[model samples]
Target: PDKDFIVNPSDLVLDNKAALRDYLRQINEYFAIIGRPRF
Candidate 1:
């Protein structure tokens, strides 16, 4: 994943373009909640 304010280790088994695109799509869609909560 690209560098961001926060990162979480995860497994991405993107076997095809559709899967990859979907992954990024979801990430982009929910970007506001994709990071660790700043304490």
Candidate 2:
């Protein structure tokens, strides 16, 4: 089985402040793991 995920900022923004915070946190963590540029 294949699963797909999508992130819609508008949807997240409307849900809760924590949602955006968590999203950014995870994105930062991923970048750190891969040693990608920050900002």
Candidate 3:
């Protein structure tokens, strides 16, 4: 998936904090490599 996840967060819903953390980790890493951050 290219630039798709950025469009929508899968409308994801988590029942726990751990799941949220995991999801965040993924996206943060996703944008970390190629996409812009605090540039």
Candidate 4:
């Protein structure tokens, strides 16, 4: 099996403020893990 580093749009539900915050956090978290600097 191969490692899957993927985050689909449906993975993050931006239905509200809280959801948006979490969405952003998750994106940044993945970027950090991949060694990409924050914007």
lDDT of each: 0.54, 0.65, 0.66, 0.62
Q: Lowest-lDDT window of 10 residues in candidate 3?
A: 7-16
Give the top-scoring candidate (TM-score): 2
Q: What is the TM-score of each candidate against the true structure?
A: 0.31, 0.35, 0.34, 0.34
Whole-model lDDT, candidate 1? 0.54
For candidate 4, list the clashing residue pairs, or say none. Answer: none
lDDT of 3: 0.66
Instruction: Report the lDDT tens digits of candidate 2 across residue range 1-39.
Output: 243334545463455565677889799778887897857
9: Cα error in model 3, Å: 26
Put down candidate 3 lDDT per residue, 1-39, tens digits, no spaces: 667445345657443455567788798888878875895
lDDT of 1 by residue, 1-39 (tens): 576423233434433455566687777567557764355
Clashing residue pairs for model 3: none
**Stretches of candidate 1 above 4 Å error?**
1-15, 34-39
- The better-scoring model by lDDT among 3 and 4 is 3
Local accuracy of candidate 4 as per-residue lDDT tens digits, 1-39: 354423434446443456566789798888887887946
Q: How close is candidate 3 to the true structure, as a TM-score?
A: 0.34
What residue runs in model 3 are displaced by over 4 Å at the alpha carbon?
1-17
lDDT of 4: 0.62
